[PDB]
Amino acid sequence: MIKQRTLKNIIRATGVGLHSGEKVYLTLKPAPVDTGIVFSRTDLDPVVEIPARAENVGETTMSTTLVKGDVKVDTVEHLLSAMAGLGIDNAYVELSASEVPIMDGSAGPFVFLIQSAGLQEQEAAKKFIRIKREVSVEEGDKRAVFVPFDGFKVSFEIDFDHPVFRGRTQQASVDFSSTSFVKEVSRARTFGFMRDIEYLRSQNLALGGSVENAIVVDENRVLNEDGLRYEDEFVKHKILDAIGDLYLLGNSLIGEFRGFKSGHALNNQLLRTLIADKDAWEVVTFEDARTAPISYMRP
Ligand SMILES: C[C@@](CCc1ccc(-c2ccc(OCCCN3CCOCC3)cc2)cc1)(C(=O)NO)S(C)(=O)=O
Ligand SMILES: [Zn+2]
């Protein structure tokens, strides 16, 4: 059987919010079967809890934001990508401020902190959302699509009209049966344009942004002294973002995602369309891991 997973021990981390620039304390706690991932604002009295589900996404400007009334949890995509990649179904995510810490700009530090603590398999079958029919959303020149596939595969195409992006890999495809999320996706960092820093800052975005937590792109080069971790790091980060955003379904997917210049807004619109079209999906479990089309690393 493919079992549900939680954390073996409590995990603590500190950082700054990419967009707010605020210092934040993060705690990851084990949770019972069928809890899902629940964010908690512990700096508030009373404490506000927000399940990490598509219905709770309130803003998609330059990150995915969870909203409950006037309470927000910003930039959940990188932590959710780490949790999806490691197969964590149930956990409590406590935060001392309105934004998840950016860390090094990738899912790498989250994956390491989680794997250092270890995972705990739970006595319940892990539920998956299996894609039965193609579901596609478009808006202008952007496209996000779910296609049936017996496993989990992500394809992505970006197209930035900038010298640092031309001649560089702008398309990547990753099948999770033959490719490790940890090795090939988790370390891909977020990126931004230095030209836009003053504009973004006037919109309350990228206030904590620097070479320490992002690939900062200048007019003709990457500013980061040590360069890139991957030649295709930019498109690999978009795959990391898609994995995190898709995890807002509340379960792992059995299918294929294809992104064409898409981002947080369109990824959430694709989940809303899928959720609504009940003939395009179903909940499945694998009562025998020996015959399942997917496998997870040892806990
Ligand atoms: C939305 C998205 C990007 C988020 C994002 C947005 C902006 C920046 C960003 C932009 C400029 C910058 O210059 C800092 C200026 C520093 N200067 C340099 C010159 O010296 C003084 C300091 C630092 C950081 C970084 C990341 C994401 O990852 N969401 O998850 S994406 C990849 O999907 O588009
Ligand atoms: Zn990102």
Side-chain angles (χ1 to χ4, degrees):
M1 180 171 91
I2 299 190
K3 288 176 177 186
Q4 284 185 33
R5 283 167 180 204
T6 195
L7 304 163
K8 202 167 89 170
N9 300 291
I10 291 162
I11 294 140
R12 294 167 175 93
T14 312
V16 296
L18 167 63
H19 291 310
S20 69
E22 303 196 315
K23 178 84 138 169
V24 55
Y25 288 89
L26 176 137
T27 304
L28 302 173
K29 293 183 173 170
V33 297
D34 300 323
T35 301
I37 294 168
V38 175
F39 282 88
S40 202
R41 286 281 309 277
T42 57
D43 56 306
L44 305 178
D45 188 17
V47 168
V48 178
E49 291 190 324
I50 317 173
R53 295 205 121 224
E55 67 186 333
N56 298 321
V57 172
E59 288 169 40
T60 52
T61 310
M62 221 175 183
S63 59
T64 296
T65 313
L66 300 178
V67 181
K68 195 184 191 178
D70 191 74
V71 176
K72 72 177 202 174
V73 177
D74 198 17
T75 327
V76 298
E77 62 271 20
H78 307 155
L79 175 57
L80 288 175
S81 192
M83 281 161 143
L86 299 172
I88 299 163
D89 297 281
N90 309 300
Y92 285 114
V93 183
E94 305 184 343
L95 289 173
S96 69
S98 64
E99 194 179 354
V100 177
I102 193 61
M103 312 307 288
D104 75 352
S106 71
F110 291 139
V111 164
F112 176 64
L113 286 157
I114 292 158
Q115 293 292 70
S116 289
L119 297 196
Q120 178 71 68
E121 286 196 333
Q122 299 172 291
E123 284 305 330
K126 188 194 214 82
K127 296 184 191 80
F128 293 79
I129 289 152
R130 192 180 70 83
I131 305 297
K132 291 167 75 181
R133 293 296 185 275
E134 179 212 343
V135 179
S136 179
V137 297
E138 288 195 277
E139 198 136 350
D141 65 326
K142 308 172 185 286
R143 191 172 150 92
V145 184
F146 282 132
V147 185
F149 177 71
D150 188 46
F152 186 56
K153 183 179 181 179
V154 175
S155 292
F156 216 101
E157 198 174 346
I158 67 176
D159 190 12
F160 288 91
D161 192 8
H162 190 279
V164 173
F165 292 80
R166 290 176 207 129
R168 186 164 298 284
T169 303
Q170 283 191 104
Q171 197 281 332
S173 181
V174 175
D175 184 327
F176 292 97
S177 69
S178 64
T179 305
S180 157
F181 168 86
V182 170
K183 262 137 67 175
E184 290 220 38
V185 183
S186 78
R187 293 179 57 250
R189 297 163 292 174
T190 190
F191 56 93
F193 301 87
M194 196 193 101
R195 188 176 185 187
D196 304 324
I197 203 48
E198 297 83 2
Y199 167 75
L200 294 170
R201 290 186 169 159
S202 80
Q203 295 296 119
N204 295 131
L205 299 161
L207 297 160
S210 78
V211 292
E212 295 300 296
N213 54 38
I215 303 149
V216 182
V217 183
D218 207 8
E219 51 171 313
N220 294 287
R221 64 184 176 97
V222 154
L223 278 184
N224 306 60
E225 200 93 341
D226 299 307
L228 306 176
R229 295 164 171 192
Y230 309 105
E231 181 280 335
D232 57 349
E233 196 169 1
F234 305 124
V235 67
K236 288 276 195 66
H237 187 73
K238 295 289 288 179
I239 288 174
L240 185 161
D241 280 348
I243 296 163
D245 285 343
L246 301 187
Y247 213 51
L248 292 162
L249 279 175
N251 309 100
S252 290
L253 277 148
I254 299 297
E256 176 179 9
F257 170 86
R258 296 181 195 158
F260 306 91
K261 300 172 83 173
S262 47
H264 307 301
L266 204 65
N267 292 349
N268 198 250
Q269 270 293 285
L270 177 60
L271 297 187
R272 291 182 181 223
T273 307
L274 176 72
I275 286 160
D277 189 24
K278 292 189 101 174
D279 275 357
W281 63 278
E282 62 186 29
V283 182
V284 299
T285 61
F286 298 99
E287 303 298 318
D288 192 347
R290 300 169 304 176
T291 67
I294 59 103
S295 68
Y296 288 92
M297 288 182 269
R298 39 184 200 87

